[PDB]
Homo-oligomer: A and B are copies of this chain.
Amino acid sequence: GFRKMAFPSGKVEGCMVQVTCGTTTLNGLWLDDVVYCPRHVICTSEDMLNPNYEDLLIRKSNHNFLVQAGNVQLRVIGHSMQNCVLKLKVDTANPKTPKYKFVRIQPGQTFSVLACYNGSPSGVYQCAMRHNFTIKGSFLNGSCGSVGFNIDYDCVSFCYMHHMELPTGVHAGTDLEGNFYGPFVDRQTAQAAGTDTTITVNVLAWLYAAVINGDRWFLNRFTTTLNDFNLVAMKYNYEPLTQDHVDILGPLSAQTGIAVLDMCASLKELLQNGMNGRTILGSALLEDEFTPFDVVRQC
């Protein structure tokens, strides 16, 4: 009764285009008369290991950039670079531009990813920004420039553009100002992320989700203080729960009548005892990619 649920992607699909420079092709986002895309579209295989991006860009001319919106070619009439993003001014404004904002999200927040190849949308799914600033996505060769977003009353808040797959199989990218999430760099190197701690407030939100959907087996008659919970949480590489997190869980607490610290005592038991093979909402593991908002929005 509770599923990972993406936002409808139509407003973003109408913005996806193809950007080609030489032998490199990736995806771009076309809003008004500007196409946003990863700047390493200008790199050849020789440039990848140590690209001096300003020195490479100054050598390019507008006509070196081939931008295709479906079948139609869009004429590039100017370009600028903002951090790791290239902004191509085109001679045609996108008639399907939605109301939109660029936002930089916080670890723990979720967004929808529209995975695209050759400027054509392929799939949509939810992702969470993890505490080490990676996301557990599904991206293949040619996916760069795919974007992540949230939608609120027909306004699309773009928060992610895709750049990289780490050796561990997780993914890294930038906001739409071209600043990476995390300590990653847009060069062709094998990069490791920091320690990935679990998003505690999201696990708790999902335990409330299970209760709303009629499952209570993991509850117990005990309680805990906030600091005693956090001591155990940190022992298991969970993020410490703040009073802001407790406040954010209030509505789910009030809906279910289970105090936040009572659910923390439930999670403490699950961490110390395991699930003993049983499952929660279909999962054999503690799910941490639903926010309190995601639970309320869906329930």
Binding site for B on A (CB under 8 A): 1-11, 13-14, 114-115, 121-125, 136-138, 169, 213-214, 282-285, 297-298
Q: How far is the CA of A252 from the CA of B4 in the complex (A)?
A: 26
Q: How far is the CA of A176 from the CA of B129 in the complex (A)?
A: 38
Given A1-B169, A283-B284, A284-B283, A7–B124 Cβ distance below 8 Å?
Answer: yes
| Main SS at interface, chain A | loop
Which 5 residue pairs of A and B lie closest in terms of their CB atoms, listed nearest first? A10-B10, A5-B123, A8-B121, A3-B138, A10-B13
Which of A6, A121, A284: most chain B Cβ within 10 A? A6
Q: How far is the CA of A282 from the CA of B130 in the complex (A)?
A: 15
Q: Are B3 and A122 in contact (CB under 8 A)?
A: no
Name the distance in Å between A192's Cβ and chain B's nearest Cβ: 17
Could you pull out 25 A-B pairs where Cβ atoms are within 8 angstroms? A1-B138, A1-B169, A4-B4, A4-B125, A5-B115, A5-B124, A5-B138, A6-B6, A6-B123, A7-B123, A8-B10, A8-B13, A8-B114, A8-B123, A8-B124, A9-B9, A9-B124, A10-B11, A10-B14, A123-B298, A124-B124, A138-B298, A169-B213, A169-B214, A284-B284
Q: How far is the CA of A282 from the CA of B298 in the complex (A)?
A: 22
Q: Are B214 and A8 in contact (CB under 8 A)?
A: no
Nearest B residue to A114, CB-CB: B8
Nearest B residue to A116, CB-CB: B8
Name the distance in Å between A282's Cβ and chain B's nearest Cβ: 8
Which of A7, A10, A115: most chain B Cβ within 10 A? A10
Contacts of A285 in B (CB 8 A): 284
Name the distance in Å between A130's Cβ and chain B's nearest Cβ: 13
